[PDB]
Amino acid sequence: EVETFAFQAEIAQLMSLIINTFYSNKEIFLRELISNSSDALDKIRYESLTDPSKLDSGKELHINLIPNKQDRTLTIVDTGIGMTKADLINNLGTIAKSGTKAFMEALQAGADISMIGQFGVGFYSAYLVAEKVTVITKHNDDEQYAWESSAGGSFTVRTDTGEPMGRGTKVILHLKEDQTEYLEERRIKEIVKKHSQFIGYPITLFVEKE
Numbered sequence: 001e002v003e004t005f006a007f008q009a010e011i012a013q014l015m016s017l018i019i020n021t022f023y024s025n026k027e028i029f030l031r032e033l034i035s036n037s038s039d040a041l042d043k044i045r046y047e048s049l050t051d052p053s054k055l056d057s058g059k060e061l062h063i064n065l066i067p068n069k070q071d072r073t074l075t076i077v078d079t080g081i082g083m084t085k086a087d088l089i090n091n092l093g094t095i096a097k098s099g100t101k102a103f104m105e106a107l108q109a110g111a112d113i114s115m116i117g118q119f120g121v122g123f124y125s126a127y128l129v130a131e132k133v134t135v136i137t138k139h140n141d142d143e144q145y146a147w148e149s150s151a152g153g154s155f156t157v158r159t160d161t162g163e164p165m166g167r168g169t170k171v172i173l174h175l176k177e178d179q180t181e182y183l184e185e186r187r188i189k190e191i192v193k194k195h196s197q198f199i200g201y202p203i204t205l206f207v208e209k210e
């Protein structure tokens with residue numbers, strides 16, 4: 001049962017800008033996604049101090065980076081707070097509308113795409129390198145969902161029947177053909193060291209088997 005939704009026009013416009021603008025410094029996507037994971041980990045950690053049972057779905061707070069050359073995917077996994085169905089369809093986008101407007105205006109005033117994170121829409125920097133983004137996510141007291149979009153104005157949400165996560169989020173980047181450098185160990189290591197070296201959770205970079 002797959003549901004298809006239209007992005008708000010402003011968000012579709014942002015995604016088109018990210019896809020169409022000539023901008024070579026694409027590597028900043030990884031910092032943005034790791035930052036998002038860190039924020040989600042911060043949130044479940046904070047909530048767990050007044051309700052310890054929120055960690056019944058898993059106590060370990062960390063981030064995995066998993067490249068797969070066969071699937072041409074880079075996956076960012078965290079055991080953070082996860083996202084609800086309401087998040088995925090309505091609430092994140094409602095928040096994102098104002099950040100998008102502010103970001104657009106900042107760009108026209110001379111800012112560049114690397115500053116996208118300040119506006120709360122850094123998630124969409126994924127489309128610098130991914131033709132399709134699949135997000136598997138599990139929040140306490142909600143089901144496991146798969147969100148997906150190849151841009152073009154729409155996204156899908158379905159209940160996920162894949163491998164159950166206890167809690168957290170997997171952002172699966174289906175990389176563009178010319179962006180496979182982000183599957184290479186030395187490249188990912190370089191980027192993490194450059195932009196994410198003080199993140200307060202373990203970041204495990206998996207090695208490709210093949």
Ligand SMILES: C/C=C/Cn1c(Cc2cc(OC)c(OC)c(OC)c2)nc2c(N)ncnc21
Pocket residue numbers: 036037040078080081082083088092093096120121122123135147168169
């Ligand atoms: C400020 C938005 C936070 C939501 N969020 C994102 C980024 C994000 C995901 C989204 O959906 C997967 C978004 O809507 C499509 C979105 O809109 C700005 C942002 N990553 C994560 C994550 N790893 N864990 C828990 N929440 C997250």
